Structure 1
Amino acid sequence: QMPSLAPMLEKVMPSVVSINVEGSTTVNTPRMPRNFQQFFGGQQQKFMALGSGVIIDADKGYVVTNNHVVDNATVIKVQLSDGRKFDAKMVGKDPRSDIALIQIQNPKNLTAIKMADSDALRVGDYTVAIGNPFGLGETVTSGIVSALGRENFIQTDAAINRGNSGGALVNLNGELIGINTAILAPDGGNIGIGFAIPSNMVKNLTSQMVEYGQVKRGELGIMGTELNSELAKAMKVDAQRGAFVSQVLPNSSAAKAGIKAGDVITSLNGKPISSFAALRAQVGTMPVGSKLTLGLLRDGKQVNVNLELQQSSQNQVDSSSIFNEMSNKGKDQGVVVNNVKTGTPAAQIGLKKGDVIIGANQQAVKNIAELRKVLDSKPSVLALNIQRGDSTIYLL
């Protein structure tokens, strides 16, 4: 009869799930009355998000999805394409790539998609996207590979006018080639065409979340922008062709090793750095503990140093199956906890600002994958062998 994508879609759909997130966040307190002819310029607020995800490990119930959907989640629900409902928990997330991993709680008879090799993609190749555009459900749209970046973001015309960046990008064989994302951050929604992380990168970032707790991406800990910013002018910067350092992050390697706002990096390991962009991307091709010597500019300053795990990708209330923001520290040198909060449920448990945890409630916790591997097997007695540098206490 007539050609159709329905035959492979039937072998694919069981792997695509819907995701309903419920969570809260801090919003500013509304000042009243409200005057709409007056252009001006803390409380938790519940919000609801919804997106798609792809079953990537049928046994473990591992579902890949966008970080812009599950971010700040308190409750994450998943509904299979056959209608069965499950609960899910955060296992990992990485805001850079806008990719996150979750785990269906109590999976039973699941189907996982097969991942194809991103590296074999070519522009005229056919593409099919599957997502939940406006909430009304699971929509599939078709097209082709528009641009192969060459980070290799995949570009495709199988998008959706005014809709939210769905999820799965699949080839004509039903294999996963990329997860569609949203490059319009803290928004969701597209620029006109579609951007996907390639399947090979998805596989890679995803395994890290599993086997470590987070992705090994080191940060230079500087924060800044281009040489056009109001501050590059309001501070008049000499020789403009590089990355403007607006501030050096606290307790960072850039901070520790030496550097101060103003200097404009001009190179990284000999190579020219013409824009924060160039730099932000280059430092992203280097895993923790790496050493990268870069040239700065004040009069003619330059240094060499080693970076540590970034702070963007971190964990929260999913390490201890219970409930309560740690992350990994250097190589397999335990799990270092970061900025504690105000509610202080975890600080209340004797955990400060820089407390490592090499003791797996008794054993070795070189990382959050392991640590969490124990706070899931023996939920009975828990004594966190934490040692924030000196103090080696054992709280419950």
Structure 2
Amino acid sequence: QMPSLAPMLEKVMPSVVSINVEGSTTVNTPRMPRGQQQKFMALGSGVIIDADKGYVVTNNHVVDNATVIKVQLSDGRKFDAKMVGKDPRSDIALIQIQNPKNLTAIKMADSDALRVGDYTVAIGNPFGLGETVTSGIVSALGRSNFIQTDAAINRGNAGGALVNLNGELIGINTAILAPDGGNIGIGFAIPSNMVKNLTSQMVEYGQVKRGELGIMGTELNSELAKAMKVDAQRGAFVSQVLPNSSAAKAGIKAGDVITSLNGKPISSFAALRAQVGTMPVGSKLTLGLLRDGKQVNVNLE
């Protein structure tokens, strides 16, 4: 008969869940005529990632400041969940289902396999009226990072799951304009792998460990810096490398002068110290290193 997503969607829908948050937050006491605790209600979607432990990935902007979190399965069943870890930078959080039973976990695809022309579908709650599904394609890939897809709802709240035609997880859709869950015109999402890495740090550490690792250099134009080349100057100097932190790994040594980070020119030396320090461990960033030919990819830790 007619082609439809319903078939695969009926295999995926189980592993998607609706999250009902109740929390409190400190707010300014209203001055009139036109600090105190105010109760709010957040509402999102999430995916069951570990059927046995009852691990449910979700967005940090949903579960932030939560006092009580509840989970309802697509079949109607409700559970209590407990926080386990969040990550405001990438807007990802892990919750756990208290008393998990007959749970289906989603099968995660290798996000590295993604290409642009690929079809996707997004499952979530743009307007809070219940689980809404929409389709589209992989519009852009922050590497081949990040996933950008036209399969996203206008004026809607960045829902949860991003899925391929086989009904596997290729990512969690996110809101880039936090603390404002909305749209920029197109959908952004953390690829499924970044998601898995991110998620295991939360299970293991209560959070994702920041990998702020230069090595131990000295500004360009300084004492030990000006001494060397300075032919084709302008950039961030690197004096040492002995810490062996993806530096004896990045094939980097003394004297180098990095001036790139995935395209964007690294002006100052602190420019590196900051940009490479706010990223999540396991990250795959590329550094355009200056020394007459040099550009290696790093892996935090």
Cα distance per residue 1:5-38 (max 9 Å; x no partner): 000000000000000111111111111111xxxx
Provide the aligned C-alpha RMSD in A: 7.7
Cα distance per residue 1:96-134 (max 9 Å; x no partner): 111100001111110000000000000000000000110
Give the TM-score taking structure 1 as reference length.
0.58
Q: Percent identity?
A: 99
Aligned to 1:360: none
Query: Alpha-carbon deviation of 1:44?
Result: 1.2
Q: Note closer, same or farther for the CA distance 1:187–1:172 as it changes in structure 2 (3 Å cut).
A: same
Query: Alpha-carbon deviation of 1:271?
Result: 11
In the alignment, is the contact (CA less than 8 A) between 2:198 and 2:280 conserved in 1?
no
In the alignment, is the contact (CA less than 8 A) between 2:215 and 2:243 conserved in 1?
no
Cα distance per residue 1:363-382 (max 9 Å; x no partner): xxxxxxxxxxxxxxxxxxxx
Q: Note closer, same or farther for the CA distance 1:231–1:182 as it changes in structure 2 (3 Å cut).
A: farther
Query: Alpha-carbon deviation of 1:212?
Result: 2.2
Q: Note closer, same or farther for the CA distance 1:266–1:4 as it changes in structure 2 (3 Å cut).
A: closer
Runs of 5+ consecutive residues of structure 2 not aligned to the other structure: none
In the alignment, is the contact (CA less than 8 A) between 2:256 and 2:289 conserved in 1?
yes
Q: Note closer, same or farther for the CA distance 1:235–1:190 as it changes in structure 2 (3 Å cut).
A: farther
- 2:282 equivalent among 289, 297, 303: 289
Aligned to 1:256: 249
Query: Alpha-carbon deviation of 1:189?
Result: 0.5
Query: Alpha-carbon deviation of 1:235?
Result: 31
What secondary structure, in the 3-state scheme, does the structure 1 residue paired with 2:128 have?
coil
Query: Alpha-carbon deviation of 1:149?
Result: 1.1
Q: How many corresponding residue pairs?
A: 301
> How far apart are the structure 2 equivalents of 1:181 and 1:276?
31
> How far apart are the structure 2 equivalents of 1:285 and 1:183?
16
Q: Note closer, same or farther for the CA distance 1:192–1:88 as it changes in structure 2 (3 Å cut).
A: same
In the alignment, is the contact (CA less than 8 A) between 2:61 and 2:91 conserved in 1?
yes
Query: Alpha-carbon deviation of 1:211?
Result: 1.8
Cα distance per residue 1:260-290 (max 9 Å; x no partner): 9999998899996238997487424877899
Aligned to 1:217: 210
Cα distance per residue 1:39-75 (max 9 Å; x no partner): xxx1111111000000000000000000010011111
What secondary structure, in the 3-state scheme, does the structure 2 residue paired with 1:68 have?
helix
Q: Note closer, same or farther for the CA distance 1:279–1:26 as it changes in structure 2 (3 Å cut).
A: farther
Cα distance per residue 1:216-239 (max 9 Å; x no partner): 214589999999999999999999
Query: Alpha-carbon deviation of 1:254?
Result: 19
> How far apart are the structure 2 equivalents of 1:33 and 1:225?
57
Query: Alpha-carbon deviation of 1:213?
Result: 2.1
Q: Note closer, same or farther for the CA distance 1:74–1:155 as it changes in structure 2 (3 Å cut).
A: same
> How far apart are the structure 1 equivalents of 2:298 and 2:4?
56
In the alignment, is the contact (CA less than 8 A) between 2:217 and 2:237 conserved in 1?
yes
> How far apart are the structure 1 equivalents of 2:164 and 2:22?
32
In the alignment, is the contact (CA less than 8 A) between 2:214 and 2:272 conserved in 1?
no
Aligned to 2:104: 111
Give the TM-score taking structure 2 as reference length.
0.76
